[PDB]
Each structure stands twice: as structure tokens, then as C-alpha cells.
């Protein structure tokens, strides 16, 4: 019921299995989430991010496909932690699917209780885009990581990073974007990863350039490439909790230090020092409580090394995996002496509603995305940073599963782009409808005190009204599917967030929904930051004519 | 800031202040929440249930009224912990208001952090119906309390409570329903209450019969009235944490024991033994941490007395204020040896979608409600228990603020009732539109392991996907306002829940919305309990033709 030896991929072209494009779309994107070229471990329904799954188990998968296939134009399917639990009458301008995954009443919102519920067949971890069917492989995060490194470069090094290098770890589905992101930002990088198969996946998808044979070889490569102003990513097979302390000991000074192991889930996502992956997985079923303690003890040593780098003047930051919290719980009292990437670097972008906006071509045709890329350039003719992004994406980002594009834009341009794409479907320029979504990391869709809402200027870090309002509003406006998840990114107890996806099928009805939903979705994030008192947000609100009563 | 010396009441009759009845309705219900005859402390914006407020502060109140008055028929107001934060374009079939109150990311979901935020002007406790504008005074809970006592009587005493008495505490807004509910179930009751003013309010609203002069006198009255087979409610001014242990010491044997003090909020809602309310309110400002400890210490003593009664064979239960949890935290390890009222008594009703369904006449006219009562009897001709409820309500429940009715009905009948009421508005039988709602305590709208989802047969107590899906579904189907709240009933950390209200303005468009909303809302509760594997819920789902894919 949790393992199936099948390769799944999204249906291609313009023939429908479901009754309409609005139901065909979630059917295709659920399948795309499990593409061998997209997902980390799809035979076990795992997309990314530890145990982030697409459906609760294989029986539930089958039933969701069957239900979407028959769903009428005025019906809405409810998905409850990856299970299709009910279908109810709404109307054609409401979402076809409403998804709520991994939500636990706060006092019980921890991995121990989640795992008890999972053993009873009652649980599924949605991560962010895993359980809400809008994962596009490593591309979904790569621009956000690039923008983080770019901003860190602007703050610390004068912008570009030629001759500099990043030290980090984690080459999973999302951590795998770190090497390429650093490269695109002009840095060399050393990326430690404990599973060879994960390094291979990154090499095969062009996300990492090369693999060193040991730490010494990695250091000779970094010294050489940085001296020559090359921007090349190196993988190193090993354990970050062993390597980072050793580098501190050798007096090695990276230009930036971060981490993107799956520290958010000690049982599943983080290899204790000295263990093989095989021992880790075997012991997780036998003695889970001991495994969690071992993993967190290693996280503590890992974080002290990051702290030690920072004490040497190295820009150090948390890249959103809750590792500081885990170290803090294990006695590293000053774990939060280095900041999260959002307060440090990315929040100003969120203040204008900018974030990991994305779209996918349901046709399966690369040229559909290239036509969107050209149309974005036409609609935003005077943003060279963004034109450069799309050029870098064309050159360096290989499609995984259905062709898709990441393109960070905010309030105003989201709706302009969506309406233009919908006109391109209408005219036949695009071969089939496109879907427009985003990560749940976005300006108005997440509350997460150790990540996206860390150190809000007004102290409102833990206020989670906002993502709940965002999902409610996306439903009222007519997103095609809308999601409310708990614990994405940072793990059980630490986040609540919303998702949205909307289908551009060329119709006038789609256009009226698009204009609303792609205004409102970034609008809520500009609102949320204006509420906190950010002048950049307030300014953007005024420019864009938001109605913010207070 | 939080105090204004004004008397607020809902506008009456057919003249609109706002632009339509869809926006006039929330405007009137917000004001009705603060009516001097309805609310516990409306000069401080407090409705019930400790510090359950209608708006965050008076500046926010003013702006909500101002905004509601101008809100257009295709706009939606977002309310974020009692603050009007944004207005966004949706459509006429979406809710006019979307409300999210008191939501905190789980690791921070506690009173200590809520109070930090409140001090900064960032918080408001919504309770259930306080911040979502559907409170109708003590009537909202009275049928639920009655059904609880009736079912306990059926389980332990062969049904009727004639010659029996209930011992309880708390005569606040919701606890004040206890005396009258016991009376209606045939029992006499002793009701202990620490504030004379609250006793007075219950006397003024005819929810309690008489006040004893002291404990000895109270017991004389209980002895007399039970011997005579009368059903009289007695208020006793004092502290439950003192009186219950004393009654145990005296060997006094009540026929059932419960509690409904505001134990869910140790800082504001529970008087420590020996203190006065005035000492309590002042010291909560100076020494909150010491006040909390003193309150919880008294709750431990109080719960131990409850446990001691139970050991003597007295039916004892928790009536939904989280007191067991507080006692357990203070070292009463067996605090949960007596059950909550929902697993003990009420869950079977929830399995058929039955719960605190209610409506209010925006006209202000008592005869509008009487006409609805007669319509319900016509549409449900063969349920004598329900006819008897409506007879008792007519005879013994006096209106507070806008005339309103509590009437517990479930899946199928809710929609039948709502469409009929909408017909009566259209025809002019009713003088003005009515609003249909409910408590957030309902089959499909709440997760609360120490209350509504305590001891779910499948262990799914903590799974909170369901209320979130209920809110999203109510939004998609066209409720007039929809709410998502945290911590209602049981306090910060212990619940998540949804609210809905829909306006019956006599239009065909309202009818289309009502038909599906009043199906879907109880439908989700039948779904939720069928998912948990309750045969009565599965049966109901089949009878009502629900589409439950699994
Ligand atoms: N900041 C963001 O914008 C953002 C976005 C998405 C995900 N995330 C978070 O990023 C983290 C990584 O996500 P993912 O999809 O790559 O996860 P994943 O589970 O697919 O991969 C994690 C990788 O970490 C490796 N690893 C674990 N322990 C290690 C150790 N001690 N030394 C070296 N490598 C080790 C594993 O081998 C695995 O390949 C997660 O915590 C996720 O929640 C952050
Ligand atoms: N079971 C349900 O269906 C349900 C529904 C609504 C509310 N509730 C809960 O019921 C409880 C009471 O709600 P309410 O609206 O009456 O609250 P309230 O705050 O208006 O009143 C609480 C009352 O308890 C009294 N009190 C506090 N400590 C006392 C003590 N030690 N001894 C005697 N009296 C004491 C106060 O004087 C006050 O009058 C809350 O916990 C609320 O969350 C339960």
C-alpha cells in the first residue's frame, strides 16, 4: 500500500481523460509530481523534503485519479492528508479540489504524534508542493536560492561573487538546486551529500558540475577555481556533521556557509555522524526515538560548526530546514545567533509580493515554455535582471517532467502574465492549457517563525491568520485547487501555509478568475507585510491600489 | 483602546445602513454580539468565554463598521484577529467576509505567547462565535447543555431527572445556560458562581431561578425541591475550588457533577481559591505568571473533588473548558478518569450532522422567530422531541438582543429549513432577512482532543484537516461569512475550528447558495465521522446520498 513498482508520468498532448481541463490539470500535475525525472522516491509516493508525499498511500492515489476523472464541473473534491474523502456540490468558479494536509491541533503538532497517526494509516506529510501537486523538480526552488546568494553577495561582497565560494550540504530534490544557484550567482560551491544516488541525480539533471574524491581533493578544486574566477559546483560524498567541524578545525574559510539537509525531520531526513544511510533507515523502523536523538545530537555539532564559521566573520545563514531549532533543543543555546535567509536577504522581495511564481505546460512541449519565456520578455521589457534569469534558465535548467518555468514576479505582473498566457492558449499559440502556481513559500501564504516570518519587525512571527485567509480568499476568487498544509519546510509544529494553482484554459471564464486570483494572491502578501509596517509594502500597496482599511 | 462606555445594539427593521442585506447582516450580527442584553462585557468588546472579543479594539471596531457599510456586492473583507486588514474583489456568490482569529503557529500556540502579542496590539481571542459574529446570548448553548443532561439521565437514571440534582459551576454567558438546561431536563441544580453580577445577569435573563444565602441554605433548598419533585435552579455565590472539596468532605452526593468555569484561560477566566475577582483582575496585570499558577493550582483541587465524587459513583463529566488538562499539568495524573461530554453523550448526534444549528431575525421582531418555529414543526412533523424543544424554547427561553433560535438538526433537515425560511422572506411572511449559522462546536467544523474529538474510535482526535476543509468548502459554496479560529472552548493550543453564517434574503441566488451550503456544512461532519469508522455516520451518509469516494 506504500510501495508500487511503477513509473508514473503525466499524460501529454491535448486528449483528456477527465471531463474538462480544470480536472485534467490536477490529474496531470499529481502524476507529474511522481515522474521518475521529477520525484526523489516516487515508488514510495515521496516527492521531496524528507517524507513529503503526493497521496497517502497507493489505494488513495488510485481513488484520487478515479475521482478526478469523473468529477463534474460544479463538484469539488476534498483531499484530507492525501486521501479523497468527499465530493460536494459548489459551482464552476470555485476550486475543483480543496486539499488540507498534515494539520494537527497544536498541542499534538509534533513528529512523534504524526508518526503514531501514520502507523494507523491516518497521516501524510504534504511538505509544501508535494501533497498539493505543483512540484516541478529542482527548478521550483532554484531562483529563490539564486536570489538569496545574489543578495548575500550584494550585502557582503559587492554583488557578483566571482572568486568566492559557498559551503553547504543537502543534494536532495530542493537542496540539489543549491550548486546551480551558486553557479548562476557566480560562486563556486562545495556541497556535501551522504547518498551517492542523490549526487548522481544532481549530476544527471545538470544541477551539480562535478564530484570530488575526498575533502582534500575538494579543497584543491575550490582553491583553483576560485583563484581563476570560475563558477563551478563540487559535490562531496560524506556527512556534514563530520565535514563542517573538520573544516573549522583546518581553518578553512568559505565565503558563505549554509545548510539544506532534511533537518526538519530527524527520523527521516538527517544522517547521524558515523552511520550509513542503510543503518539509519533500518534503525528508524526499530528504535525511532533513539534515531531522532542521534540525528539531533549530530545537528548540534553541525550547527556549532556553522556558529564557529560565523565567529570567523563568515556570512552564515539558515536556509529553511529548522536545523537551528533542533540544535537549540539539544543544548546549543545560541543556535539562533545566525539568521534565516528571509529576514536577512529575501523579505524585501516579499514586500512587493515577489516570490516563486511558476507555470507548467500541460501539453508536455518544451516550445510551449519557450513561447511563455518570450512573452514574459515582451510584457516586462525593461527588467534586465529578469531577462537574464530566463536566459540562464534556458541555458542551464533542464526540464524535469512536464516543461515548467520558475520566474519570480510580484503584485501586478502576476495577473498580467496569467491573462496573457490564457490569451495564448485561446489563440492556439500554446498547444494546450497551462497551469500557474507557486511554492507555499510566498509573501502571503506562510507563517513560519524560523523561516519566512522570522523576526518580523512588529514581532508577529507566529501569527498564522494570514495563510488561512489567503487560502480562503483563493477559494472565493476561483483558483482551480487550493491547499492548507502544516509543517512544510521546517517540520511538524513550525509552519502553516497555503497553496494555489489556477488553470489557464483559454476561456473568458478562466480570464475573469485569473485577473482576480493573481491580483489577490500576491495582494495578501503585500497586505501582510504592510500590516507589519514595512514601508516597501505600504508603498507597493499604494502603487497597486490595494484597499487596506487600516 | 479596549474600553468605550457605549451601548451598542443591532439596527432593526428593513432599512439598510450597508449596501445590501449580504453586508447589512454581518454589520447587524457584529453589533448584536455587543448588545448589553447579549454580551458579558461589551464595553471592553468581550462577548463570552473569558476574553472572547468581537473586534480587536475600538479603533478596529470602528473601521469594521465603516468598511462593512461601504463594501460592494463583489468585494470580500478580510478580518484578521478582529482587525479589518484588506478588501479584495471576488464575486457575489463568495462570502462577503472571511475571518481568521487567534491562529498561531503550533510551537507558539499558547497563552503566554498570545498575551505577548496582545500587549503589542497584535492579538484577539475569537472564542468560537465572539469573533465570528453569531453569538445569541445563553441560548446558543442551552439546547446542547440540555441534550447533555438528558443523555446522561438516560444512561444513568432511566431518563428523566425528577428528584435529582446537578452540581456545577460557572454562570457566565455560556455557563449561565446550565441552570435552565438542568431545569428543562427535569433536574434541580446548584450552580456556583464567583461574581454577583453574573448571578444577576442570569436572574435578569431568567436562566436561573433563585440565589441561596450560603452553602447550608443552598443544600436546604436542594433537599426540599428534589423531595417535592420540582426542577429549580439555585445560584450560590462562591468559589468552586472551595465548595466542591467541602461538599466532598461533608459526604454530599449530587446526582451529576460537571463544571463550566472559564478554566481554558487560567489568567482571565478562573478565580483561585480565596481570591476575589477584583484581586484576580488586578494581579493578572502585575504578576500574570503567578496568577496562572495560582489558578491552575486551584483547578487541580477542583478536579480532585470531581474525581472524588466520581469514585463515590456519581456521574461526572467534563463540559468543555479544558479543566482536566490544567489539573493534569499541575500534577493530577488521573484527571482524565472522567470523560468529556462529547464522547460520553453527544457524539451520536454529531454522527448524523446534528449540532447547534441556529438562526436570527435581522428585523428584531419576536414574531419572525415564532413564525419560523411554526414552520419547523410543519417541516418536521414527526419528531416529538424536537417539537417539545421548540415548545420549551417558546415557554422558557427569553430572547436576548435580536430574536434568535437554537434548534439542533442535522444533515438533510438543515437545507430543508433554510430553503423554507428563504421562501418566507421572499413571500413577506418574515418581515426581513434571517441569518442561519451555528456554533463552531459542530460535527464537521472542529478538532479538539479534550472536547469535540476526544477519544475518536480510530485515534484521529488531533487531526485538524477537517475544520480547515469545512471552511474552504463553505467559502466555495457561498456562505455569507466564513471563519477559521484557534483555541475556542478549550484555549490556546487545544483546538482549531470553523464558522459559517449564511443570509436568507429571499432571492433565488440565496436559494442556490443555501441548498448546497446547508448540505455541505453538516455533510462534512457526517463525512468526518464516517471516515473515523462510526457506523451511524456511514449509515447517515448512505441515507443522504453523500459522495464519499473511499
Ligand atoms: N528554504 C527553502 O526555500 C526551502 C524550500 C523547499 C524545501 N526546503 C527544505 O530543504 C531541506 C531539503 O529539502 P530536500 O527536498 O532537498 O530534501 P530531501 O529529503 O529530498 O534531501 C535531503 C538530503 O539531505 C541529505 N542528508 C541528510 N543528512 C545529511 C548529512 N548529515 N550530511 C550530508 N547530507 C545529508 C540526504 O541524503 C538527502 O539527499 C528540507 O528541510 C526542506 O523542508 C527549504
Ligand atoms: N461545552 C460547550 O459546548 C461550550 C460552549 C461554549 C463555551 N464553552 C466553555 O465554557 C466555559 C465558560 O464559558 P462562559 O461563556 O460562561 O465564560 P465566561 O468567561 O463568560 O464565564 C465564566 C464564569 O466562571 C466564573 N468562575 C471562574 N472561576 C470560578 C470559580 N473558581 N468558582 C466559581 N465561578 C468561577 C466567572 O465568575 C464567570 O462568570 C469556557 O471554558 C468556554 O470556553 C463550552
Option in B102, B464, B471 nearest A104 (CB) = B464
Are B546 and A84 in contact (CB < 8 Å)?
no
Name the strand (E) or helix (H) holding B517. helix B508-531
What distance in Å separates the CA atoms of residue A465 and residue A456, rounded to the nearest whole number? 15
What distance in Å separates the CA atoms of residue A278 and residue A330, rounded to the nearest whole number? 24
Name the strand (E) or helix (H) holding A118. helix A111-119
Burial class from Cβ neighbours inside 10 Å (0-12, 13-18, 19+) for residue B190 reads buried
What distance in Å separates the CA atoms of residue B279 and residue A224, rounded to the nearest whole number? 73
CB B72 within 8 A of CB B80: no
CB A143 within 8 A of CB A406: yes
Dig out the grid coordinates for B25 from the structure: 447582516
CB A168 within 8 A of CB A218: no
Q: What ligand 2 atom has the least distance to the C-alpha of B265?
A: 41
Question: How close does chain B come to A550, measured CA to CA in Å?
Answer: 6
CB B210 within 8 A of CB B185: no
CB A44 within 8 A of CB A65: no
Q: How far is the CA of A451 from the centre of ligand 1 (A)?
A: 15
Option in B75, B465, B519 nearest A103 (CB) = B465
Q: Whose CA is nearest to atom 17 of ligand 2?
A: B49
Partners of A46 in beta bridges = A41, A53
What distance in Å separates the CA atoms of residue A403 and residue A406, rounded to the nearest whole number? 11
Question: How close does chain B come to A367, measured CA to CA in Å?
Answer: 34
Are B462 and A78 in contact (CB < 8 Å)?
no
CB B497 within 8 A of CB B491: no
> Which of B42, B145, B175 to mutate to test ligand 2, by most ligand atoms within 8 A of the CB atom?
B175
Closest by CA position to A40, among listed A155, A159, A174: A174
Q: How far is the CA of B265 from the centre of ligand 2 (A)?
A: 10
- For residue A526, the chain B residues in CB contact (below 8 A) are none
Q: How far is the CA of B206 from the centre of ligand 2 (A)?
A: 18
Q: Return the axis-axis angle of helices A139-156 and A384-396, rounded to nearest 10°.
A: 130
Closest by CA position to A454, among listed A299, A357, A350, A541: A350
Question: How many other CB atoms sit within 10 Å of the CB of residue A204?
Answer: 11
Partners of A99 in beta bridges = A79, A483
Q: What is the DSSP string of B234-281?
A: EEEES-HHHHHHHHHHHT---SEE---S-TT-TTTS-PPTT--HHHHH
Burial class from Cβ neighbours inside 10 Å (0-12, 13-18, 19+) for residue B107 reads buried
Burial class from Cβ neighbours inside 10 Å (0-12, 13-18, 19+) for residue B228 reads exposed
Option in B80, B87, B468 nearest A547 (CB) = B87
Q: What ligand 1 atom has the least distance to the C-alpha of A441?
A: 3
Which residues have a Cβ under 8 Å from the Cβ of B243 and sit 6 or more positions away?
B169, B192, B215, B236
Count of alpha carbons within 13 Å of A92, Cβ hemisphere only?
9
User: Where does B287-412 have alpha helices with state H?
Assistant: 288-311, 323-329, 341, 347-350, 366-379, 384-396
3-state secondary structure of A501: strand
> Which of A146, A175, A258, A275 to mutate to test ligand 1, by most ligand atoms within 8 A of the CB atom?
A175
What distance in Å separates the CA atoms of residue A240 and residue A246, rounded to the nearest whole number? 9
- For residue A85, the chain B residues in CB contact (below 8 A) are 527, 531, 548-550
Q: How far apart are the first and last CA of chain B?
A: 51
Dig out the grid coordinates for A168 from the structure: 553547504
Are A106 and B101 in contact (CB < 8 Å)?
no
What distance in Å separates the CA atoms of residue A174 and residue A67, rounded to the nearest whole number? 30
Q: How far is the CA of B235 from the centre of ligand 2 (A)?
A: 14
Name the strand (E) or helix (H) holding B189. strand B188-193
Question: How many other CB atoms sit within 10 Å of the CB of residue B545?
Answer: 9
Partners of A404 in beta bridges = A360
Under DSSP, the state recorded for B405 is: E
Nearest 10 degrees: Cα torsion A441, A443, A448, A451: 70
Ramachandran angles phi, psi of A43, nearest 5° = -70, -20
CB A41 within 8 A of CB A48: no
Are A106 and B496 in contact (CB < 8 Å)?
yes
Closest by CA position to A76, among listed A65, A92, A88: A88
Q: How far is the CA of B174 from the centre of ligand 2 (A)?
A: 7
Q: Return the axis-axis angle of helices B177-184 and B384-396, rounded to nearest 10°.
A: 130
The distance between the two most distant Cα atoms of chain B, rounded to a whole number of Å, is 65
- The ligand with the least distance to the CA atom of A192 is 1
What distance in Å separates the CA atoms of residue A53 and residue A42, rounded to the nearest whole number? 8
Are A113 and B459 in contact (CB < 8 Å)?
no
CB B208 within 8 A of CB B171: yes
CB B184 within 8 A of CB B227: no
Q: Whose CA is nearest to atom 1 of ligand 1?
A: A320
Ramachandran angles phi, psi of A289, nearest 5° = -60, -40
CB A74 within 8 A of CB A90: yes
- For residue B497, the chain A residues in CB contact (below 8 A) are none
Count of alpha carbons within 13 Å of B541, Cβ hemisphere only?
27
- For residue B76, the chain A residues in CB contact (below 8 A) are 473, 476
Ligand 2 site, residue B538, Cβ cutoff 6 A? no
What distance in Å separates the CA atoms of residue A195 and residue A40, rounded to the nearest whole number? 12
Helices (H) and strands (E) in chain B — how many of each?
19, 16
Are A531 and B85 in contact (CB < 8 Å)?
yes
Ligand 1 binding site (Cβ under 6 Å of any ligand atom): A 40, 48-50, 141, 144, 169-175, 192-195, 198, 239-241, 260-264, 269-271, 319-321, 441, 489
Q: For chain B, what is the radius of gyration of the CA atoms?
A: 22
Q: Find the catalytic residue in B60, B188, B351, B407.
A: B407
Ramachandran angles phi, psi of A172, nearest 5° = -85, -160
Please report, for residues A373, B204, B292, the alpha-carbon distance to residue B146 in angstroms, rounded to integers and kept in the order given: 65, 20, 32
Closest by CA position to B342, among listed B109, B525, B110: B525
Per this entry, what is the length of chain B? 550
CB A85 within 8 A of CB A79: yes
Closest by CA position to B26, among listed B101, B131, B173, B142: B131
Ligand 2 site, residue B448, Cβ cutoff 6 A? no
Sign of the Cα torsion A435, A438, A444, A448 reads positive
What distance in Å separates the CA atoms of residue A187 and residue A122, rounded to the nearest whole number? 45
CB A190 within 8 A of CB A257: no
Closest by CA position to B198, among listed B181, B175, B214: B175
Task: Name residue, grid cell 557566480.
Answer: A186
Q: What is the DSSP string of A236-263?
A: EES-HHHHHHHHHHTT---SEE---SST
Question: How many other CB atoms sit within 10 Å of the CB of residue A403?
Answer: 23
What distance in Å separates the CA atoms of residue B211 and residue B217, rounded to the nearest whole number? 10
Q: Return the axis-axis angle of helices A288-311 and A240-249, rounded to nearest 10°.
A: 30
Partners of B253 in beta bridges = none
Ramachandran angles phi, psi of B375, nearest 5° = -65, -40
Partners of A484 in beta bridges = A100, A498
Question: How many other CB atoms sit within 10 Å of the CB of residue B381?
Answer: 10
Please report, for residues A171, A192, A246, A307, B303, the alpha-carbon distance to residue A215 in angstroms, rounded to integers and kept in the order given: 17, 10, 9, 21, 62
Which method resolved this structure? Answer: X-ray
Which residues have a Cβ under 8 Å from the Cβ of A197 and sit 6 or more positions away?
none
Distance of CA A263 to the CA centre of its chain: 15
Q: How far apart are the first and last CA of chain A?
A: 51
Which residues have a Cβ under 8 Å from the Cβ of A31 and sit 6 or more positions away?
A8, A9, A10, A11, A65
Dig out the grid coordinates for B45 from the structure: 468588546
Closest by CA position to A280, among listed A239, A330, A322: A239
Name the strand (E) or helix (H) holding A502. strand A496-504
What distance in Å separates the CA atoms of residue B63 and residue A305, rounded to the nearest whole number? 51
What distance in Å separates the CA atoms of residue B27 and residue A378, rounded to the nearest whole number? 46
Q: Find the catalytic residue in A188, A351, A407, A540.
A: A407
What distance in Å separates the CA atoms of residue B494 and residue B265, rounded to the nearest whole number? 11
Classify domain B138-345 by CATH number: 3.40.50.10730
Domain chopping of chain A, boundaries: 1-137+346-550, 138-345
What distance in Å separates the CA atoms of residue A429 and residue B529, rounded to the nearest whole number? 49
What distance in Å separates the CA atoms of residue B252 and residue B242, rounded to the nearest whole number? 14
What distance in Å separates the CA atoms of residue B467 and residue B490, rounded to the nearest whole number? 16
Burial class from Cβ neighbours inside 10 Å (0-12, 13-18, 19+) for residue B48 reads buried
Option in A108, A493, A549 nearest B63 (CB) = A549
Name the pairing type of β-strands B496-504 and A52-53: unpaired
In Å, what resolution does this model reach? 1.8
- For residue A94, the chain B residues in CB contact (below 8 A) are 475-477
**Class of B1-137+346-550 in CATH:** alpha beta
Name the pairing type of β-strands A357-361 and A434-438: antiparallel
Name the strand (E) or helix (H) holding A485. strand A481-486
Question: How close does chain A come to B461, measured CA to CA in Å?
Answer: 9
Question: How close does chain B come to A256, measured CA to CA in Å?
Answer: 30
CB A393 within 8 A of CB A370: no
Please report, for residues A102, A159, A355, the alpha-carbon distance to residue B482 in angstroms, rounded to integers and kept in the order given: 22, 47, 28
CB A126 within 8 A of CB A45: no
Question: How many other CB atoms sit within 10 Å of the CB of residue A146?
Answer: 23
What distance in Å separates the CA atoms of residue A38 and residue A201, rounded to the nearest whole number? 10
Q: How far is the CA of A33 from the centre of ligand 1 (A)?
A: 17
Under DSSP, the state recorded for B58 is: H
Q: What ligand 2 atom has the least distance to the C-alpha of B243?
A: 32
Is A60 a catalytic site residue? no
Question: How close does chain A come to B245, measured CA to CA in Å?
Answer: 30
Option in A83, A549, A550 nearest B550 (CB) = A83
Amino acid at each position: 500500500n506504500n510501495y508500487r513498482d511503477v513509473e508514473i508520468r503525466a499524460p501529454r498532448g491535448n486528449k483528456l481523460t477527465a471531463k474538462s481541463w480544470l480536472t485534467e490539470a490536477p490529474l496531470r500535475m499529481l502524476m507529474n509530481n511522481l515522474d521518475p525525472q521529477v520525484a526523489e522516491n516516487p515508488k514510495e509516493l515521496v516527492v521531496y523534503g524528507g517524507i513529503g508525499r503526493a497521496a497517502r498511500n497507493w489505494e488513495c492515489y488510485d481513488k484520487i485519479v478515479e475521482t478526478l476523472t469523473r468529477l463534474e464541473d460544479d463538484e469539488t473534491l476534498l483531499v484530507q492528508s492525501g486521501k479523497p474523502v468527499g465530493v460536494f456540490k459548489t459551482h464552476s468558479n470555485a476550486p475543483r479540489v480543496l486539499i488540507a494536509n498534515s494539520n494537527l491541533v497544536p498541542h499534538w503538532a509534533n513528529w512523534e504524534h504524526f508518526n503514531e497517526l501514520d502507523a494507523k494509516g491516518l497521516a501524510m506529510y504534504g511538505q509544501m508542493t508535494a501533497g498539493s501537486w505543483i512540484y516541478i523538480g529542482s527548478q521550483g526552488i532554484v531562483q529563490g536560492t539564486y536570489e538569496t546568494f545574489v543578495e548575500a553577495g550584494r550585502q557582503h561582497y559587492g554583488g557578483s561573487l566571482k572568486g568566492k565560494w559557498v559551503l553547504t550540504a543537502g543534494l536532495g530534490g530542493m537542496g540539489g538546486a543549491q550548486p546551480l544557484a551558486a553557479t548562476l550567482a557566480g560562486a563556486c560551491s562545495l556541497n556535501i551529500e551522504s547518498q551517492q544516488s542523490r549526487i548522481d541525480f544532481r549530476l544527471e539533471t545538470r544541477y551539480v558540475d562535478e564530484q570530488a574524491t575526498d575533502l582534500d581533493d575538494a579543497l584543491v578544486r575550490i582553491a583553483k577555481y576560485t583563484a581563476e574566477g570560475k563558477a563551478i559546483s563540487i559535490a562531496l560524498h560524506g556527512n556534514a556533521a563530520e565535514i563542517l567541524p573538520e573544516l573549522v578545525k583546518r581553518g578553512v574559510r568559505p565565503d558563505m556557509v549554509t545548510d539544506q539537509t532534511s533537518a526538519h525531520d530527524p527520523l527521516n531526513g538527517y544522517l547521524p555522524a558515523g552511520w550509513t544511510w542503510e543503518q539509519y533507515r533500518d534503525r528508524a523502523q526499530t528504535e525511532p526515538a533513539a534515531v531522532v536523538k542521534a540525528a539531533k545530537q549530530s545537528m548540534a555539532v553541525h550547527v556549532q560548526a556553522m556558529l564557529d564559521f560565523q565567529k570567523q566573520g563568515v556570512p552564515t545563514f539558515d536556509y529553511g530546514n529548522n536545523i537551528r531549532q533542533m540544535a537549540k533543543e539539544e543544548g546549543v543555546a545560541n543556535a539562533f545567533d545566525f539568521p534565516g535567509f528571509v529576514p536577512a536577504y529575501i523579505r524585501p522581495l516579499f514586500c512587493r509580493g515577489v516570490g516563486p511564481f511558476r507555470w507548467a505546460a500541460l501539453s508536455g512541449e518544451a516550445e510551449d515554455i519557450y513561447k511563455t519565456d518570450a512573452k514574459v520578455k515582451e510584457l516586462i521589457p525593461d527588467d534586465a535582471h529578469l531577462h537574464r534569469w530566463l536566459d540562464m534558465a534556458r541555458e542551464r535548467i533542464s526540464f524535469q517532467g512536464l516543461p515548467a518555468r520558475i520566474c519570480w514576479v510580484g503584485l501586478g505582473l502576476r495577473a498580467k502574465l496569467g491573462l496573457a498566457f490564457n490569451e495564448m492558449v485561446r489563440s492556439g499559440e500554446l498547444s494546450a492549457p497551462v497551469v500557474i502556481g507557486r511554492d507555499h513559500l510566498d509573501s502571503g501564504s506562510v507563517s513560519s517563525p524560523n523561516r519566512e516570518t522570522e523576526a518580523m519587525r512588529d514581532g508577529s512571527d507566529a501569527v498564522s491568520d494570514w495563510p488561512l485567509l489567503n487560502a480562503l480568499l483563493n477559494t472565493a476568487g476561483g483558483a482551480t485547487w487550493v491547499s492548507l498544509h502544516h509543517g512544510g519546510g521546517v517540520g511538524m509544529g513550525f509552519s502553516q501555509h497555503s497553496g494555489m494553482v489556477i488553470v489557464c484554459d483559454g476561456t473568458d471564464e478562466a480570464a475573469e478568475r485569473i485577473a482576480r486570483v493573481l491580483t489577490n494572491d500576491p495582494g495578501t502578501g503585500v497586505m501582510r507585510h504592510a500590516d507589519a509596517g514595512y514601508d516597501i509594502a505600504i508603498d507597493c500597496a499604494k502603487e497597486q491600489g490595494l484597499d487596506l482599511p487600516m
